[PDB]
């Protein structure tokens, strides 16, 4: 009903959009829900617990492309996986920061495992496959963060105007392709001086 | 002497390491300096002003490879530039977060301009050159952030052990190379279906 995981999180995500990750207090959460702080405490011990639940919920609820489809190329996977992660992180104010601050839940563990098994199955060593998975996450996280926080040099007047027109998807997608291709030339490289 | 840009910043960076970007208050800064809050206020109007000064100072003081060397390849530049940015951001607790939250200073503007002029001079369109500069920054920022904030699946026991041994430099450098190579195949691509 009013106080159970379901509503507590719905209300939390909603509150998150209203005041950001910093303005988010168990105090104001209690008020939004319309209950006394100790009633809330019983269900949510503190902000850390709250954020932890929001992070996994943000992903589960919106990172629909967390795991690959049988018969899909690793390139398509990493690409689609990165887009879904970005969109998921962008759905909520400070989403990226909420993610960044949470220690990976076991839901994420079986997820990474699968993805990693996938990469290895594509001729990727555990090391390089993990590196790839990480480079993609790192780059996606950095892009979303930059995007969520946000006299003139001539060239920049032009460059800037390309950032000021689109919402940063193009630049991300382009960078994404360059990232993926870097892995391609690496995989196909084997024991060569590539 | 005690209250001037010099010391105020030295003390701020030092305080930053002690309590992070969140624990950093003008109140505790005043106390560290040994003065009354209004005395401080005269020199630093607020936390935002403080952070702004710390961001540029963090970069100027430690991002020694901000601009290219005459006769250097764009690959070498982006690589060295990314490493210097990462090291700079890692010098101080929450360095990446301090950077993320600051609107680019004009020092950064002439810097980006130059770098952008460099890329164009290497056959890079303003668009793609900016994309490259951004992908590198985005990825570097994401890596440092992940690094600054931080039952077991079989494969992950191995993968994890490669993260748990090194400090994340290898994974970054590897990802960096894959990023740069993606740009190479793009530049050399021209009007081709690459």
From Swiss-Prot, chains A, B:
Domain of life, per lineage: Bacteria
Gene3D superfamilies: Homeodomain-like, Tetracycline Repressor, domain 2
Annotated Mg(2+) binding sites: 99
Gene Ontology BP, a term: response to antibiotic
NCBIfam families xref list: PRK13756.1 (NF010319)
Subunit structure: Homodimer.
Annotated organism of origin: Escherichia coli
Key words, A-Z: Antibiotic resistance, DNA-binding, Magnesium, Metal-binding, Plasmid, Repressor, Transcription, Transcription regulation
Family matches, as PANTHER family: HTH-TYPE TRANSCRIPTIONAL REGULATOR RUTR, TRANSCRIPTIONAL REGULATORY PROTEIN
Regulation: induction: By the [Mg-tetracycline]+ complex.
Ligand binding (tetracycline): 63, 81
Pfam families: TetR_C_1, TetR_N
Gene Ontology molecular function: any one: transcription cis-regulatory region binding
Domain HTH tetR-type: from-to ranges: 2-62
Protein name, as recorded: Tetracycline repressor protein class D
UniProt DNA-binding residue ranges: 25-44
Function per UniProt: TetR is the repressor of the tetracycline resistance element; its N-terminal region forms a helix-turn-helix structure and binds DNA. Binding of tetracycline to TetR reduces the repressor affinity for the tetracycline resistance gene (tetA) promoter operator sites.
């Amino acid at each position: 009903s009013r106080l159970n995981r379901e509503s507590v999180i719905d209300a939390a995500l909603e509150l998150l959009n209203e005041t950001g990750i910093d303005g988010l207090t168990t105090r104001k959460l209690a008020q939004k829900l319309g209950i006394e702080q100790p009633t809330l405490y019983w269900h949510v011990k503190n902000k850390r617990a709250l954020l932890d639940a929001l992070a996994v919920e943000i992903l589960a609820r919106h990172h629909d492309y967390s795991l690959p489809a049988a018969g899909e190329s690793w390139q398509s996977f990493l690409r689609n996986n990165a887009m879904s992660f970005r969109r998921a992180l962008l759905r909520y104010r400070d989403g990226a920061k909420v993610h960044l601050g949470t220690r990976p839940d076991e839901k994420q563990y079986d997820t990474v495992e699968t993805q990693l098994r996938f990469m290895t199955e594509n001729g990727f060593s555990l090391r390089d496959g993990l590196y790839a998975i990480s480079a993609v996450s790192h780059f996606t996280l950095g892009a979303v963060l930059e995007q969520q926080e946000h006299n003139l040099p001539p060239l920049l007047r032009e460059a800037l105007q390309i950032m000021d027109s689109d919402d940063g998807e193009q630049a991300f997608l382009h960078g994404l392709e360059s990232l993926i291709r870097g892995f391609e030339v690496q995989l196909t490289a084997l024991l060569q001086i590539v």
